[PDB]
Amino acid sequence: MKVILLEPLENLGDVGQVVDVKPGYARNYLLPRGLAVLATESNLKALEARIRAQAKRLAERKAEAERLKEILENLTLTIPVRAGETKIYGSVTAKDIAEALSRQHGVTIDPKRLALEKPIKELGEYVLTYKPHPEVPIQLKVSVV
Amino acid sequence: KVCEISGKRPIVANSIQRRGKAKREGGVGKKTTGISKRRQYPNLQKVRVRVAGQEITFRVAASHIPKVYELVERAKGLRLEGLSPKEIKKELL
Amino acid sequence: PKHGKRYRALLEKVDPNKVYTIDEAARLVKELATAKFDETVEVHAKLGIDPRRSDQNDKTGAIHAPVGKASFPPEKLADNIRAFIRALEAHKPEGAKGTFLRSVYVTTTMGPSVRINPHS
RNA sequence: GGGCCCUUAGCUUAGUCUGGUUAAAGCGAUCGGCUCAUAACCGAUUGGGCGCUGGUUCGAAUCCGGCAGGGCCCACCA
RNA sequence: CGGGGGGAACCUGGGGAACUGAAACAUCUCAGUACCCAGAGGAGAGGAAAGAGAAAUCGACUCCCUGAGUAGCGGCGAGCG
RNA sequence: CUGGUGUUGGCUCUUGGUCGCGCCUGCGUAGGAUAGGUGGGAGCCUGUGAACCCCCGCCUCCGGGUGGGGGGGAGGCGCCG
RNA sequence: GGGGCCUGACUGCGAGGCCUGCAAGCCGAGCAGGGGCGAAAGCCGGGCCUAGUGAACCGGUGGUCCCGUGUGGAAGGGCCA
């Protein structure tokens, strides 16, 4: 009695998994409470048809998410910050690193999705990395005027 | 009575009574002491399923029980409402 | 512990659950016979005969005898594994029911045993 | 005539499938103490070709076949 | 849009006897007959091979003639076929 | 009346028959000693740490057989007899 | 009645008769095969004789020229006992 699951259970669990039970159990518990469904061709194939469509769907958020690897990692950041000495005038965060990062030549960034922390606020030179899976490393430029 | 899926119904069968040793084995053979008419009924049970809002139930030969949930599945492609589990059952194929 | 080392390494060259031929067996007799002397090849075999039968080895139905040394060519030990299998199949009693070549295992005086097949 | 249960000193359990080994018992009479009787009431006694003809083994109640003994049930009967 | 009810037989389906025969009787016979029931129609049924069965075979189904009281079935009885 | 099945499902407790396999088991005379048969059979054992002592558990014909662990340290064992 | 060898208490038949409603029952010379006793002629197909018994059916064993559902073989029959 093949049966595709949902709410992972003991000694048989983890969604979309197919584990055969006894008609009795499936018939009057699992199917009644929506804790699984018949491993029918109908569903059984529509499973893979949603198993691939999430792997090849995630293979686009780590594929086109990787075209951003070998591009905006080496082509280092060029930030003309208005600093001065040992403590800049405007720190540095997404509102900074990213903001102007965009200006450079069209660099789209995230608010905290990178390696963010506290806004630089300290003249020198730092470098962080993107995120996640498996992410890409890029630098920074603590400029002065 | 009668199965709502397969239309299985009670058939008529005899009730043969043999005696003696089977020629197959020892010898002489078996003799029939009495033939009697009788019925063999299907092993039909009651199957309650939800489907839509109403309930619905089935007098179905146990043998076919599954075919019940085969319908309850492909029953989600039709438009079954209007408070009536009498028309919902009717509906199912 | 239970066995030595000259035997503990020989358990590495034999599958605990596998049948072999009279070629890969009469050959594996060389590497498991690691004794400072001429190890002896003894083909032990369980028979399908009654122990307390006057007309049907020992009193438990398990015959056995040696027919080779640890230095004899891998092919000269393949001549007596077929000649000792045909010597016995030449004395199967009339009313002796049950697979005669019930269980055959070939081992040396010391080295481990490898359950081999008497028909290949 | 189909099978499936079974066969030691009087009775009636043995041990035997796990041979190289001791056959013990109660009942049974006898003999003794017995007491001013008898279940004696103790005691001492007191026996088994282990059905039989044979095989293996240095060895057979025990393991090897070839036959009978009853008590057991099964079943069939033209 | 259809159904309902009727129709002398004929037809198909669902049920289905006993007297009788066996010179008793229980298997067997009468008999899937009588009868009850539902339905069809001027007919009904069946029908284009998951066949037949021994022929380098035939080629839907139905009906008549043969085959044949044969092959067989059978308290191997009566009889059935 | 009754067993086997179907309708009939979850969870544990305890348990049989089997075949795998891994370990143990055997104490009549005498024999160093608690000898399953029968064959191989002159070498394994030990630095995969042997001789020796303590704690510990199982079996026990109360004689021992034997597993684990620390210490320890270069010695045990078979033929022969 | 006694003894010495012996097993014809053979197989394959059986002219011609007794008895007789049927079917049963009884007697039987002689030919072939291979035997026993006897020197031989010969005698022997159980017993001085008349009772000691049971058609068919259905099955069991043992064989065997037989049949073996397309073919080979089986299954199961037939024939003899």
UniProtKB/Swiss-Prot annotation, chain A:
Keywords from the UniProt entry: Ribonucleoprotein, Ribosomal protein, RNA-binding, rRNA-binding
InterPro entries: Ribosomal_bL9 (IPR000244), Ribosomal_bL9/RNase_H1_N (IPR009027), Ribosomal_bL9_bac/chp (IPR020594), Ribosomal_bL9_C (IPR020069), Ribosomal_bL9_C_sf (IPR036791), Ribosomal_bL9_N (IPR020070), Ribosomal_bL9_N_sf (IPR036935)
SUPFAM superfamilies for the chain: L9 N-domain-like, Ribosomal protein L9 C-domain
GO cellular-component term (any): ribosome
GO terms classed as biological process: translation
UniProt cross-references to Pfam families, sorted A to Z: Ribosomal_L9_C, Ribosomal_L9_N
GO MF term set: rRNA binding; structural constituent of ribosome
Family: Belongs to the bacterial ribosomal protein bL9 family.
Family matches, as PANTHER family: 50S RIBOSOMAL PROTEIN L9
Protein name: Large ribosomal subunit protein bL9
Natural source organism: Thermus thermophilus (strain ATCC 27634 / DSM 579 / HB8)
Gene expressing this chain: rplI
Curated annotation (Swiss-Prot), chain B:
Protein name as it appears in the record: Large ribosomal subunit protein bL28
Signal peptide (residue range): none
Pfam families: Ribosomal_L28
Domain of life: Bacteria
GO cellular component: ribonucleoprotein complex; ribosome
GO BP terms: translation
NCBIfam families: L28
Similarity comment: Belongs to the bacterial ribosomal protein bL28 family.
Organism: Thermus thermophilus (strain ATCC 27634 / DSM 579 / HB8)
Alphabetical UniProt keywords: Ribonucleoprotein, Ribosomal protein
TM segment ranges: none
UniProt xrefs under InterPro entries: Bacterial_rp_bL28, Ribosomal_bL28, Ribosomal_bL28/bL31-like_sf, Ribosomal_bL28_bact-type
GO MF annotation, one: structural constituent of ribosome
Subunit note: Part of the 50S ribosomal subunit.
UniProtKB/Swiss-Prot annotation, chain C:
Cross-referenced InterPro entries: Ribosom_uL1_bac-type (IPR005878), Ribosomal_uL1 (IPR002143), Ribosomal_uL1-like (IPR023674), Ribosomal_uL1/biogenesis (IPR028364), Ribosomal_uL1_3-a/b-sand (IPR016095), Ribosomal_uL1_CS (IPR023673)
One GO MF term attached to the UniProt entry: structural constituent of ribosome
Record's subunit section: Part of the 50S ribosomal subunit.
Function statement: Directly binds to 23S rRNA. Forms what is known as the L1 stalk, which protrudes beyond the 70S ribosome surface. The stalk is preferentially stabilized in 70S versus 50S crystals. Interacts with the E site tRNA, blocking the exit path. This blockage implies that this section of the ribosome must be able to move to release the deacetylated tRNA. Protein L1 is also a translational repressor protein, it controls the translation of the L11 operon by binding to its mRNA.
Protein name as it appears in the record: Large ribosomal subunit protein uL1
Record-linked CDD domains: Ribosomal_L1
NCBIfam families recorded: rplA_bact (TIGR01169)
Family as reported in the entry's similarity comment: Belongs to the universal ribosomal protein uL1 family.
One of the Pfam families matching this protein, by short name: Ribosomal_L1
Cellular component terms per the entry's GO annotation: large ribosomal subunit
Keyword list, A-Z: Repressor, Ribonucleoprotein, Ribosomal protein, RNA-binding, rRNA-binding, Translation regulation, tRNA-binding
An individual GO BP term: translation
Transmembrane helix found in the keyword field: no
Domain of life: Bacteria
